[PDB]
Symmetry: C4
Subunit: 394 residues, 4 copies
């Protein structure tokens, strides 16, 4: 076993094909399936796995009550093979966690899970299933991380964490690890900016991240760094906003440097992703501008380098009549594709229950997963498909 290089360029793709759908909530109507949220996908040398944060409870059980809540001592990071439901008997325990990231360095799985009190949380780093290191909260205000795959290159793994207020200036740090031990860290200077839940991927030896601004920006922060943790930080240049909530495209003017907000879009957001394509960008977003409803992906011409409004392609993978949620990025390594470039993929979370469906006592989500291909691919609507309310709701 050797470390994955992961220093190849990201593939240029013209479409995204569906790779997986777990149907977890449909199955959990009768089967034994965890209540979850914040699913994400990460790939090792031989397989991809779906990670998720459980609520330490099963669907259609009384312990699923009040699972709209984000943090508790019962949440854990677990994983299943890609496409499996997050069920009670296949789930592999990874970390105690109400916020997490995970990735594979070519030799072993790395998992970073945060638990503890809001004012004194800490991350536990697991490597090959063994606890190796700890990262303590440095601002004592809900230490939190990506909720998606971290990035490994040449035996080093990288991820981004945040600590501080949800709706004002916070603190943002990049971490570097080797075999589960933190070997470097760097605080990112981003005055007036806000970074949470970064979706990161490798591209030609650098880590490129598209994040969530939960403060004054309806545009997404972009963070790019190298092995030294030297970084560039700013916003996705595109004159098309991709956070939620946001305003209509015609009411928006892009910026590469500043958070663009107002119009009732401040103080919230949703985890999302984007992939640089030379000077252009593939960016995902909810179809609704106000709620987590529907999902589409847009190819914006020169959207990575200028405030372009030119949409070259648009593909819908979930219609606006269905609930979406978080979305995130990962890549498929060369050891699985035998290609000369890294394949960009994304996953989509579809949230059911509270708060949008008030007649249910619980909140969970299921997922779909898509990977980039060299040709155009039609869209459709692959919705969660569960029929609510459930038995436990009655």
């Amino acid at each position: 076993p050797e470390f994955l290089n992961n220093t190849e360029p990201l593939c240029n793709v013209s479409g995204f094909a569906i790779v997986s759908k777990d149907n977890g909530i449909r199955i959990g109507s009768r089967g034994h399936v965890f209540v979850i949220r914040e699913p994400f996908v990460a790939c090792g040398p031989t397989e991809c796995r779906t990670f998720f944060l459980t609520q330490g409870a099963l669907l259609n059980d009384k312990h699923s009550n009040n699972t709209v809540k984000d943090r508790s001592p019962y949440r854990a990071l677990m994983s299943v093979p890609l496409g499996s439901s997050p069920n009670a008997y296949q789930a592999k325990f990874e970390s105690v966690a109400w916020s997490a990231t995970a990735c594979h360095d070519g030799k072993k799985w790395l998992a970073v899970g945060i638990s503890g009190a809001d004012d004194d949380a800490y991350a536990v780093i697991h490597y090959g299933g063994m606890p190796t290191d700890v990262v303590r909260s440095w601002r004592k205000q809900i230490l939190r991380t990506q909720e998606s795959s971290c990035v490994c290159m040449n035996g080093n793994c990288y991820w981004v964490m945040t600590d501080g207020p949800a709706n004002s200036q916070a603190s943002y740090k990049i971490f570097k690890s080797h075999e589960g031990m933190v070997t470097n860290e760097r605080e990112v200077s981003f005055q007036g900016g806000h970074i949470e839940e970064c979706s990161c991927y490798p591209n030609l030896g650098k880590v490129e991240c598209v994040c969530r601004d939960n403060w004054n920006g309806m545009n997404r922060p972009i963070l790019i760094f190298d092995e030294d943790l030297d970084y560039e930080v700013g916003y996705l240049c595109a004159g098309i906003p991709t956070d939620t909530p946001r305003v209509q495209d015609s009411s928006f003017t892009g910026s590469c440097t500043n958070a663009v907000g107002g119009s009732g879009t401040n103080n919230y957001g949703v985890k999302g992703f984007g992939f640089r394509q030379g000077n252009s960008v593939w960016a995902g977003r909810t179809v609704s501008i106000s709620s987590r409803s529907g999902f589409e992906i847009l190819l914006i011409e020169d959207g990575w380098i200028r405030t372009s409004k030119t949409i070259v392609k648009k593909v819908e993978v979930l219609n606006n009549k269905n609930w979406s949620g978080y979305s995130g990025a990962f890549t498929i390594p060369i050891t699985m594709t035998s290609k000369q470039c890294l394949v960009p993929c994304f996953w989509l979370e579809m949230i059911r229950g509270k708060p949008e469906e008030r007649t249910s006592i619980w909140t969970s989500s299921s997922s779909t997963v898509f990977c980039g291909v060299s040709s155009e691919v039609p869209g459709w609507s692959w919705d969660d498909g569960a029929i609510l309310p459930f038995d436990i709701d009655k």
Copy 2:
């Protein structure tokens, strides 16, 4: 690990012995078992697996409602070890799919799954669990494939797809792939003929397929091709019809070149199989001439090359008092048998629920599997065995 040659001659067999029965519907009365249809079997170098198309729902759950429907965003191709029920906790996810084929090239599993809208569907090709290629609908009319094992030889895997009307002239293509990438394709010219759901197997370096004509033929199309995708196409010569619906044998006259229909048999059919045995043929068929009821296999003397009505052997594996369904072919490679020829096997789908059992809200199936042996083997009736209606039906 090396590629399977699979260029040996097909074994001549004198009987078929039962190898597996999953009892999935019986088990799913209480256990957690997927609602499925279109099961099939494929074998790798070390094991055989049962593949199936789920309805993204479990038996005896409310989401099993209306599962007589053929296509939805919730259907997925999954697999279990041969003989296991298609249950929620052993199932391995293979592809999002409402139509599929799969096979093993000696190194990795290949899975081809079709999803999307009827007028813009696409196949995603998975190799070793990774998405590798895509095949788009070329006629924009329900792109569809075998619902049985594809065929791999010398590292190349082959399968047949159809696109176009269900009850008139459609378009038929053969595909060739290597390591999950399509490397060749060929459209089959078959005017007045109709090809769907091919059951294919290797025989002396060629792929031989016995298919379903859903148009004007109660006889089965035969398609034979080589590595160049050079092909011969026609109908099973035997003066014994093996599709359903069909007419009584005495009312039928065979043809090697033309679809023989009429008498209320047009515009429907069922997936079935046959194995060439020199100039003769082993062919399966339902016992009923009008419905998917019962199952028998016939050895027809010279039935591959002329309109023979001579039945040398007949074996019943399901009596006419029980529901059958699709049936398909696969082979066991030399790496498992240490033989000098490929062993022909078939599986039988037994459908329960709609439309034949109207008091149930759901439709699923279970399977039995049989393999050819060098001596005669008695038949019996290995029925599904489930007692309907189920709890959810009441």
Copy 3:
């Protein structure tokens, strides 16, 4: 991987220690566990597994109705790791079967499963999970086999089958196989004798079997054969009867050559076992002389060679207040113990439900497993422990 020699002498043991208890019926009150009977244990180079014949149905489900019946198209031979319940999600499918035997030759698992109609049944031989050969009924009267482990030596595996009447002269054959192919067979001449459900084990290069006489004998037949299938056949000499039903010891006179019966013991029996210990024998038997109740093991001095009534040791592993059933023998190979002799072990089936517990609609069993050790070991009573009736019974 190499073939197991298995030609070492059987160990002399002074006691039996409990190794496993599956608690399957207790667990199946809520868990998803197969209705079974005829469990047995067989060991490979790296692990022991519990085999069992399912009824193709789960405990506490409606399909468990009428499972007192012995043969149906829904019964299958499956296996789980030693000590696991025979549950729906760990069970490995081995063969379609209402009678079976299985063993490991050092390289692969061999499974022999009989199915089909009573008057035309056939055994399918599975090797490494692949169907390899078939053995047809030669008397057309319920072809049947050991319901316990077969014996493998130097790459050859051996087992005993019976065909013919249950309560009069039948036909008995020994089979030899290599890599799943039958390579030799021998009919055993045993006029006035009856052989069923042999419990066999290797001892110094010979196969020694202790069987069930379902005709005129309350003493157990003994069958001993070598690689040529040259055999000796007779009865366990001991002046202590070990079948059930039987008479009190004081009313019994042993015989090495003749079936000893009468006194209302004719025409029934139970599968049981014994281990030669030089000239002595360890023999199991129910505590009750009339029903399958309780279980004890006796060491009878010189009981293998003469009509001795001398009991050197007696150990009870199930008191007479609890239901027992079949029992059988297996051995642990040298590759697991690193010893110079083969370790004798037995399993005990504990039957619950019909016919002894009439208020239940079903019949199943659980098991305990014991292995011989060089010192004396106390007994106890490890009963099934399930509380009947179950929910489905009400």
Copy 4:
């Protein structure tokens, strides 16, 4: 595969980070999860596993009735991957047992399980899943062992057993084994002392144990021995009592040689642990002095060598509003951490049901697991989290 040395010094740690939480009782409200108690953790070269003693029954089933009872024929030692619930479908059977210990020598798992009658119990030793040896009760009074991991060094595995009265002078023995065979034993002379349920770990080639005195001591016995089973025995010197029940710290005076009791603390106790840290000690204890409620860990300066009352650090991992239970020690070997010292970890059992929660008919527990790290780590309260009563209680 080679034997683990395990002769390195124990790491000096400044804090304990949470590694795992199984949420088994919460999950078992709907999922199929064993009723258990006495969980513990042991680590092999490649993974850690959670062991537990089942009651041969599942949560929320009628067979969970009266599971406050400690010994029955239905209890078994089983294991799951660290962090998994003790569920019916992942559980690996290890031994029949109502008292147990287990550990990994670098090549195979060793499990020691005690069953049988109170007055004639015996331990069965399992090695690599095979029964290898037996240890009989020598005082005929509930032979019993650690209920936590044993210790392996250089291919030899060590554990402590007790036989005799629960509330007066008993007999205590140390055992040494190689490949599952007992190779040495030593009776420990400890007049006026009482030893049960030792928590042991390797430290610089010696085994150090912190145990439970169920007689006259509210301080914990300490037992230290080498490969020859030469031992030192006494009590934890610290002037801080760590058993339960106990008195307030201010009312306690420590002793290195004598049991310190009285004040209503006699004749009971709870399994607990401690780790030597040079001359100091990390010791766990319930927060309540009278019941198994809450849990904290204390670093006591020079507490291993003198009657110190100096508490350098205190960390709470379960508040006093929640039920705790047993706790135990294990270490992580060098093969997983690549360190030069052994990492100390502990697990905590959280008991729900009888006798503290009288409205439930059952008793079970779940667990949390913590490992030592080189820096201080905040505490929190990771409680069991189940909402009682359960369905079966009503």
